[PDB]
């Protein structure tokens, strides 16, 4: 059977800018090469098929070129929206072969997070657990710092965090940070702090609330 | 015009056998326009090929699979079907229904050209749990309202607002296992502050569990 | 593509000391920074000044836009022989704040700028720590004098220390920079009587 060997498996690059991907079969599949797109949770795209025809819709920015081993596809000028994994296909034999995948990230500029603190709903406190969200929303770049504080005591182990793909506009990132206590240390302690640090911030940022 | 929809259980216990369906509309499933193929996807991993189906009903299988997938038409009901037996946490996936036009200058030219959705699929012993929504309410111009999905299973469950109305500036973020076996996420959402005086609901679903919730949020 | 920046420092063109004045709004993909560059012409730094080189050197050089602070009661013109343009003259992206006239009483104000545009702005200000007391009442009339900065993630307080450090570019004084990263439909607010340097225009970061 034919594999087929994609490279890189990650890359970044500012809007604007080219960008291409390669592909390489085993051996020849003359031109039955397919290029995908996969926006994440979604199903794959066909944005090229026969090495370089596009689909009807897919912008002009999106072009493929090769034939026999070799493969192309290359973005002429990155859009926000082009954030994906990208895959290529050889058709020529059965069975097909998918590529191992590109993921397309977006370079922006730094952009620091804008915090905020949730307490617990009434309701989640008579069932007899609490969880306490931090949010920061819309920064970049994606490594971040977060730390709780009650009653300004340093929490470790008690929380998990959650982080969502780069948006398709802007580029940035937004994160969770979720502590979660029994209902019996929620009720304990009086103020509950989210600590932020991260490149955007010349100094962390605290947020907080009064139980 | 053809579009397709998988359906199908999202949970199946060890050793069991996985089946799902694949609708096809706005075509014939056997006029030889297509044909017809299965996909998955383990989390964070590419595309896998389980097989095709063609106009005549013949197959073509991954070789690492044959011994447990079968993939079938039924063009009384414009559907084709995908069978897994044996199934291992392995076999924990997306799974996406394709189609590919046929083509007379290669048989395979036009690649997949027509997707499904994709469905997810788990394989665990554990059971179908339903959903808990939580408010999310509390700086100057703008603040945050958000929705916390607590204790569900198994994956996944989709989140929008105001029935799909408010959309920009809304973040669900991607579920968490929690240490219980259970997953939790929440959905948020950045609005003007001086509209805290209009109405923001967040509309859960749980399919897996048959359940629907809709709650609203406010300090 | 390359900008050489000679003289100037690369915090320079934030804040533009006369040795800064053609880099004010540069655009270049890679910056050669030299041995030979200073950020000021009056003595100080920034205060946290590698991160802040850090995020320029990312990006693709700067665009300024005005921020639209107006002033009653005061003089906007305070200027240095420190930072000569053949003549006493000061920052270019700043305002140095002063009583109307020495010893005069200077009032309690507020400032806020909303950044509307759908990039974060790089608000800079500076703290000035004036030689002396006596020199600190000249330029900005007597009693304590007090700087808050807000914005929706900061709220911090400065309060000057004045005191004669050795004589830097001829001057015993410090005038020490501040940063922060104001997101999209964000306002900045400053509030202070004295001792304070303004901001006259923003920094937005070019794509690289
Ligand atoms: C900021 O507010 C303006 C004015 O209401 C609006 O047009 C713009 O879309 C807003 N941008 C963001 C990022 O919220």
């Known amino acids: 059977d034919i594999q087929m060997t994609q490279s890189p498996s990650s890359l970044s690059a500012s809007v604007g800018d080219r960008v291409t991907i390669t592909c390489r079969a085993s051996?020849?599949?003359?031109?039955?090469l397919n290029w995908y797109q996969q926006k994440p949770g979604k199903a794959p795209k066909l944005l090229i098929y026969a090495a370089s025809s596009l689909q009807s819709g897919v912008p002009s920015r999106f072009s493929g070129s090769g034939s026999g081993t070799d493969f192309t596809l290359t973005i002429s000028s990155l859009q926000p929206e082009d954030f994906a994994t990208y895959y290529c296909?050889?058709?020529?034999?059965?069975?097909?072969?998918f590529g191992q995948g590109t993921k397309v990230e977006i370079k922006r500029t730094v952009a620091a997070p804008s915090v905020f603190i949730f307490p617990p709903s009434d309701e989640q406190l008579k069932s007899g657990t609490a969880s306490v969200v931090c949010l920061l929303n819309n920064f970049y770049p994606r490594e971040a710092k977060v730390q709780w504080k009650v009653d300004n005591a340093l929490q470790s182990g008690n929380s998990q965090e959650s982080v969502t793909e780069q948006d398709s506009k802007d580029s940035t990132y937004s994160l969770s940070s979720t502590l979660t206590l029994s209902k019996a240390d929620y009720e304990k302690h009086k103020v509950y702090a989210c600590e932020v640090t991260h490149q955007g911030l010349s100094s962390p940022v605290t947020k907080s609330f009064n139980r | 015009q053809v579009q397709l929809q998988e359906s199908g259980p999202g949970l199946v216990k060890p050793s069991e056998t996985l089946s799902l369906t694949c609708t096809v509309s706005?075509?014939?499933?056997?006029?030889?326009?297509?044909?017809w193929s299965w996909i998955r996807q383990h989390p964070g991993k590419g595309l896998e090929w389980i097989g095709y189906?063609?106009?005549?009903?013949?197959?073509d299988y991954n070789p690492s699979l044959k011994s447990r997938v079968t993939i079938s038409v039924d063009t009384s009901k414009n559907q084709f079907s995908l069978k897994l037996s044996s199934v291992t946490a392995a076999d924990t996936a997306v799974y996406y229904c394709a189609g590919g036009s046929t083509g007379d200058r290669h048989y395979y030219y036009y690649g997949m050209d027509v997707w499904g959705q994709g469905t997810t699929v788990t394989v665990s012993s554990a059971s179908t749990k339903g959903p808990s929504v939580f408010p999310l309410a509390p700086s100057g111009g703008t603040a945050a309202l958000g929705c916390l999905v607590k204790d569900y299973f198994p994956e996944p469950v989709t989140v929008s607002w105001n029935s799909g109305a408010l959309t920009s500036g809304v973040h669900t973020f991607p579920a968490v296992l929690q240490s219980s076996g259970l997953y939790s996420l929440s959905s948020v959402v950045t609005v003007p502050s001086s509209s805290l005086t209009q109405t923001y609901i967040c509309n859960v679903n749980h399919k897996p569990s048959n359940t629907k919730v809709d709650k609203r949020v406010e300090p | 593509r390359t900008v050489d920046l000679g003289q100037c420092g690369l915090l320079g063109t934030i804040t533009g000391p006369p040795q800064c004045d053609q880099f004010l709004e540069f655009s270049a993909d890679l910056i050669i920074e030299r041995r030979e560059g200073s950020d000021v012409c009056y003595p100080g730094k920034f205060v946290n000044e590698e991160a802040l080189r850090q995020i320029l050197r990312e990006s693709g050089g700067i665009d300024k836009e005005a921020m639209g602070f107006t002033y009653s009661g005061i003089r906007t013109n305070g200027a240095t022989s420190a930072c000569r343009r053949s003549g006493s003259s000061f920052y270019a992206e700043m305002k140095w704040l002063l009583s109307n006239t020495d010893n005069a009483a200077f009032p309690q104000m507020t400032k806020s700028y909303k950044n509307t545009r759908k990039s974060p702005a790089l608000i800079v200000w500076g703290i000035h720590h004036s030689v002396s007391t006596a020199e600190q009442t000249k330029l900005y009339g007597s009693g304590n004098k007090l700087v808050t900065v807000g914005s929706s993630n900061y709220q911090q307080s400065f309060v000057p220390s004045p005191g004669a450090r050795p004589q830097v570019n001829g001057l015993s004084g410090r005038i020490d920079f501040h940063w922060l990263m104001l997101n999209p439909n964000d306002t900045v607010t400053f509030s202070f009587n004295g001792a304070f340097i303004a901001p006259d225009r923003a920094s937005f970061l070019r794509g690289k």
């Open positions: 051996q020849s599949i003359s031109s039955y």
């Open positions: 706005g075509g014939s499933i056997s006029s030889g326009g297509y044909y």
């Open positions: 296909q050889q058709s020529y034999s059965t069975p097909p072969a």
């Open positions: 189906i063609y106009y005549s009903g013949s197959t």
